[PDB]
């Protein structure tokens, strides 16, 4: 079987990333990775009438640029796996309306990034799709109309807070040889240690990432030594240290091989509090900077773990806790 | 390859439904299928403090009853594929927190029913999971937050899928694509989803070189009173008449006396009707090959506020009396 261990998929047929596209907003463009994005904007509106339309334009760009690079058209794709953090997945659904590609709407909060890639890889390895397209997007303002710090009460947004990344990433997956190769994926399970504070996501998601990372090592009988980098989605300032401790306390120290996209996307000068977040966070950083590091040879085997928080206002209203999840995928220099 | 045609998956290894569980609310319990549900309630609250907790209890029931029937425990499951129509998928996420089974949150409006089952079948056939659990739920109250309107079904259905022999067998699935003819009226879903169902049904026939004659029944999710006639016309106008082999869950779940307008709707609509009544018909032999097509409308208030249209989609799965 392809299922190895408890939660890990090891693909039999070689699965590769044929092309990757990324688009990002102004704050991203001016960040330390801004020059690596395929498309950028100076205005959050992205030349659109509304925030929702902006996020859509971001995904449109990532998808088209990805298809363009591999000299492909929407008709060369068999499956489309996408999802966004805004309810009903408006972004993906409307973009899918345009692509007219058999659509499988995914959603795992800010872990959608790797969810879509993991299942897409499995469907291409299982022979259900010759070519698959996995995409995700996020917009600072759209996510703000859904949830925001109630300033009207005079309090101040805590340092534990984070800032949603404005951008989108898309990737093309198939059995056709490429520079980057997807070798395994670990599907995570829901974790809930009891966190209730909706403003400290880092500490809430840390356990989920550690769980998935730990189960992944055990499933493949591997350790941190088997990777050049263990990249986490958006644990940011608060969660990064916490995940490194839990891993160490579990006998699987990640040491200095760990890093987080939310810490790489921006610079501590762009007033982004703890660090970056959002579905687009892990996606834009991986599809541009970590794919590149891998192509250039600066890296060989990386483990990307997108983390997500499944918390709604109505639930926190009923004294419920904040469940979290983490999904991981292993990328390697072909 | 397993991919046949444009959008259809034909599984190589035999995939079966080992067990199915369903739970429903009062209006369902008193309907013409009420006696077939595993668990029912007389109060929409389902002995819970809030509507959200009620829906959760509904999914808990369906999952446990399904696991109970096949003498299984949450630890016997490798993958959990569920989704609900309320934003952020609160129901599935919290239920998943309890099952602690590797979770893949799905969402395709009222088509989630078949989406979860189709991808679950593919992951079990591809060898990524020995046992998969697909579930969906819907609650009339959480859903709200003329003669064209519909009424959300209160209930939940769950199924267990694996390569271990069972009474019902899943032989193929057709993944649908987004359709948008231009409907903008958020109160006539039947006419908005009809095209999506017709498209998926048509592509499915062409992919497998089949016709309506190859099925004893073509079941649609919740086209209801308005969409059912429309889908039959489009199919006829396309050279693929479904004739009298068509029926809709929203027309079977309730009786035109329970004041449910056009008919039933919601993720739970197609699920509870299929996992109880149509699985049973198949076990008893009253049916042999059925094609279930769950349809969904992807419309939000904020989008309709910007003069946008209503995109829809339909996913189908072929269940066969093994």
From Swiss-Prot, chain A:
InterPro entries per UniProt: SpoVAD, SpoVAD_sf, Thiolase-like
GO biological process, one term: sporulation resulting in formation of a cellular spore
SUPFAM superfamilies in the record: Thiolase-like
Keyword ATP-binding listed: no
GO cellular component: plasma membrane; spore wall
Pfam families: SpoVAD (PF07451)
Keyword Secreted: no
GO terms assigned for molecular function: acyltransferase activity
This protein's UniProt keywords: Sporulation
Listed NCBIfam families: PRK08304.1, PRK12404.1, spore_V_AD
Protein name (database record): Stage V sporulation protein AD
Originating species: Bacillus subtilis (strain 168)
Swiss-Prot record, chain B:
GO process terms (BP): sporulation resulting in formation of a cellular spore
UniProt-listed InterPro entries: SpoVAD, SpoVAD_sf, Thiolase-like
GO cellular component, one term: spore wall
Pfam family, one: SpoVAD
Record keywords: Sporulation
SUPFAM superfamilies cross-referenced by the UniProt entry: Thiolase-like (SSF53901)
Highest taxon listed in the record's lineage: Bacteria
GO MF annotation list: acyltransferase activity
Protein's recorded name: Stage V sporulation protein AD
Native organism: Bacillus subtilis (strain 168)
Lineage: Bacteria, Bacillati, Bacillota, Bacilli, Bacillales
């Amino acid at each position: 079987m392809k299922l190895t261990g408890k939660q890990t998929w090891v693909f039999e047929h070689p699965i590769f990333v044929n092309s990757a596209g990324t688009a990002a907003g102004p704050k991203e463009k001016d960040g330390p990775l801004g020059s690596l994005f395929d498309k950028t904007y100076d205005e959050m509106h992205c030349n659109q009438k509304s925030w929702e339309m902006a996020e859509r334009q971001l995904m449109e760009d990532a998808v088209n640029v990805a298809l363009q690079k591999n000299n492909l058209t929407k008709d060369d794709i068999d499956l489309l796996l996408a999802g966004d953090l805004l309810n009903q997945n408006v972004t993906a659904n409307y973009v899918a309306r345009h692509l007219k590609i058999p659509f499988l709407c995914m959603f795992g909060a800010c872990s959608t990034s790797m969810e879509t890639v993991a299942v897409a890889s499995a469907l291409v390895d299982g022979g259900f799709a010759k070519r698959a397209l996995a995409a995700t997007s996020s917009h600072n303002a759209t996510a703000e109309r859904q949830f925001r710090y109630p300033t009207e009460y005079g309090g101040q947004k805590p340092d534990t807070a984070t800032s949603t990344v404005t951008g989108s990433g898309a990737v093309v997956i198939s059995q056709t040889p490429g520079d980057i190769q997807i070798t395994s994926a670990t599907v995570g399970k829901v974790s809930d240690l009891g966190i209730t504070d909706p403003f400290d996501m880092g500490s809430a998601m840390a356990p989920a990432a550690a769980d998935t990372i730990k189960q992944h090592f055990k499933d493949l009988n591997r350790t941190a030594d088997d990777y050049d980098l263990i990249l986490t989605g958006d644990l940011s300032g608060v969660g990064s240290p916490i995940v490194k401790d839990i891993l160490k306390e579990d006998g699987y120290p990640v040491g200095t091989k760990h890093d987080d996209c939310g810490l790489l996307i921006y610079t501590p000068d762009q007033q982004v509090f703890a660090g970056g977040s959002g579905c687009a966070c892990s996606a834009v950083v991986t599809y541009s900077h970590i794919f590149k590091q891998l192509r250039e040879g600066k890296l060989n085997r990386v483990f990307v773990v997108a983390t997500g928080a499944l918390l709604s206002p109505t639930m926190i209203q009923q004294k419920e806790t904040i469940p979290t999840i983490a999904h991981g995928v292993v990328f390697e220099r072909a």
